[PDB]
Amino acid sequence: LGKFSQTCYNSAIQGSVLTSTCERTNGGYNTSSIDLNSVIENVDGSLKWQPSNFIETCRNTQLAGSSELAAECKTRAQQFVSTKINLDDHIANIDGTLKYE
Amino acid sequence: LGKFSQTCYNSAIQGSVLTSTCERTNGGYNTSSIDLNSVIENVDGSLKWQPSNFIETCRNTQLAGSSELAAECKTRAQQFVSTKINLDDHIANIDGTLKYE
Numbered sequence: 001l002g003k004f005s006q007t008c009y010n011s012a013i014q015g016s017v018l019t020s021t022c023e024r025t026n027g028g029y030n031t032s033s034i035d036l037n038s039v040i041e042n043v044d045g046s047l048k049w050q051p052s053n054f055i056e057t058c059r060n061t062q063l064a065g066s067s068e069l070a071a072e073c074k075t076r077a078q079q080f081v082s083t084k085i086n087l088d089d090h091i092a093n094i095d096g097t098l099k100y101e
Numbered sequence: 102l103g104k105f106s107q108t109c110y111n112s113a114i115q116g117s118v119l120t121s122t123c124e125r126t127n128g129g130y131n132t133s134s135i136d137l138n139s140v141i142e143n144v145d146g147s148l149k150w151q152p153s154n155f156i157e158t159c160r161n162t163q164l165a166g167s168s169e170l171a172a173e174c175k176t177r178a179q180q181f182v183s184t185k186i187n188l189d190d191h192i193a194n195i196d197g198t199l200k201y202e
C-alpha cells in the first residue's frame with residue numbers, strides 16, 4: 001500500500017494538508033492535496049495511521065437531497081442495514097474547497 | 102460547522118468521494134473533492150463522524166525528505182515530543198491524486 005512518493009515530486013506539508021504533484025497513470029502530472037487532519041491520530045505523543053471501516057463495511061453510497069449521504073452498512077452481526085448521515089454537519093465550503101471541520 | 106450545500110452546487114458521491122462546485126468567498130467557483138473514507142465510520146450499521154486529534158494536539162509539522170512527516174505531539178503526561186511517521190506507508194498516488202488507503 002501507499003508508496004505515493006516514488007511517483008510524485010515537490011510535495012509540501014502545511015498545517016495538516018499534504019500537497020504533491022504526481023504522474024497521471026499515462027501522460028500528464030497532477031497537483032493535488034489531502035488533509036491529514038483525518039488520516040492521522042496522535043496516541044500518547046505518536047503519530048498513528050487512523051483506521052476506518054467505512055468503505056470496507058458499507059456499500060451503495062449515494063447522495064440524497066443536497067447534503068445527505070446514504071449507504072447500507074454491516075451491523076456487528078454482519079447484517080447490512082440502511083443508514084444515512086447529514087454531510088452538512090461537518091463538511092464545509094472553505095473558499096471553494098470542501099473541508100472536514 | 103459545515104453547511105457546504107448552502108454555497109455549493111452540482112454535488113455527487115462516487116464510492117466514498119464527494120465532489121461539488123462551491124463559491125469562492127467572492128468571485129467564481131471551484132470544483133473540489135474530498136474522500137470520505139477517513140471522515141466517517143460505521144458503528145454497528147450506523148454512520149457517524151470520526152473525530153481525530155492531530156490538529157488539536159500536535160504542532161509545527163514538517164516534511165522530511167521524500168515522504169516523512171514530522172511534528173511535535175502531546176503525550177499522556179502533558180508534554181510535547183518529536184515524532185515522525187513515513188507517509189509512504191499509506192499515502193498512494195492514484196492516477197495523479199493523493200489517496201489514503
Ligand SMILES: CC(=O)N[C@@H]1[C@@H](O)[C@H](O[C@@H]2O[C@H](CO)[C@@H](O[C@@H]3O[C@H](CO[C@H]4O[C@H](CO[C@H]5O[C@H](CO)[C@@H](O)[C@H](O)[C@@H]5O[C@H]5O[C@H](CO)[C@@H](O)[C@H](O)[C@@H]5O)[C@@H](O)[C@H](O[C@H]5O[C@H](CO)[C@@H](O)[C@H](O)[C@@H]5O)[C@@H]4O)[C@@H](O)[C@H](O[C@H]4O[C@H](CO)[C@@H](O)[C@H](O)[C@@H]4O[C@H]4O[C@H](CO)[C@@H](O)[C@H](O)[C@@H]4O[C@H]4O[C@H](CO)[C@@H](O)[C@H](O)[C@@H]4O)[C@@H]3O)[C@H](O)[C@H]2NC(C)=O)[C@@H](CO)O[C@H]1O
Nearest residue numbers: 091092093094095096102103104105106107108124125126
Ligand atoms: C472588509 C470590508 O470592507 N467590509 C465591509 C462590510 O460592511 C461588509 O462585510 C461583510 O462581508 C461578508 C463577506 O462575504 C459578507 O458575506 C458573507 O458572510 C459571512 C461573513 O463571515 C463572518 O461571519 C462568520 C460567522 O457567521 C456566523 O454568524 C453570522 C450572523 O452573526 C451568520 O452568518 C451565521 O449564522 C454564522 O454562525 C456560525 O458561526 C458561529 C461562530 O460564532 C459558530 O459557532 C456556528 O457554527 C454558527 O453556525 C465568520 O465565520 C467569518 O469568519 C471570516 O472572517 C474573517 C475574514 O474576514 C476571518 O477571520 C475568518 O477566518 C473568515 O474568513 C466572518 O467573521 C461568511 O459566511 C461568508 O463567507 C462564506 O461563504 C463563502 C462561499 O460563499 C465561503 O467561501 C466562505 O468560506 C464562507 O463559507 C461558509 O459559509 C457558507 C454559508 O454561508 C457554507 O455553505 C460554507 O460551508 C462555509 O461554512 C462555514 O461558514 C460559516 C463561517 O464562515 C459557519 O456558519 C459554518 O458553520 C462554516 O464554518 C461571507 O463573507 C457579510 O454578510 C458582510 N456583512 C455582514 C455579515 O454584516 C461588506 C459587504 O459584504 O462590505 C464592506 O464594505
Ligand SMILES: OC[C@H]1O[C@H](O[C@@H]2[C@@H](O[C@@H]3[C@@H](O[C@@H]4[C@H](O)[C@H](O)O[C@H](CO)[C@H]4O)O[C@H](CO)[C@@H](O)[C@@H]3O)O[C@H](CO)[C@@H](O)[C@@H]2O)[C@@H](O)[C@@H](O)[C@@H]1O
Nearest residue numbers: 001002003004005006007023024025026193194195196197
Ligand atoms: O505500493 C504502492 C501501493 O499502491 C500502488 O498503486 C499506486 C501506483 O501508481 C500507479 C502506477 O501505475 C502505472 C500504471 O500501471 C501504468 O499503466 O504503467 C506505469 C508504468 O510505466 C505505472 O506507472 O503509476 C502511475 C503513474 O506513475 C500512477 O498514477 C498509478 O496510480 O504505484 C505508485 C508508486 O509510487 C503509488 O503511488 C501507488 O501505490 C499499488 O500498485 C501497490 O503497489 C500498492 O498497493
Ligand SMILES: [Mg+2]
Nearest residue numbers: 038139140151
Ligand atoms: Mg479518520
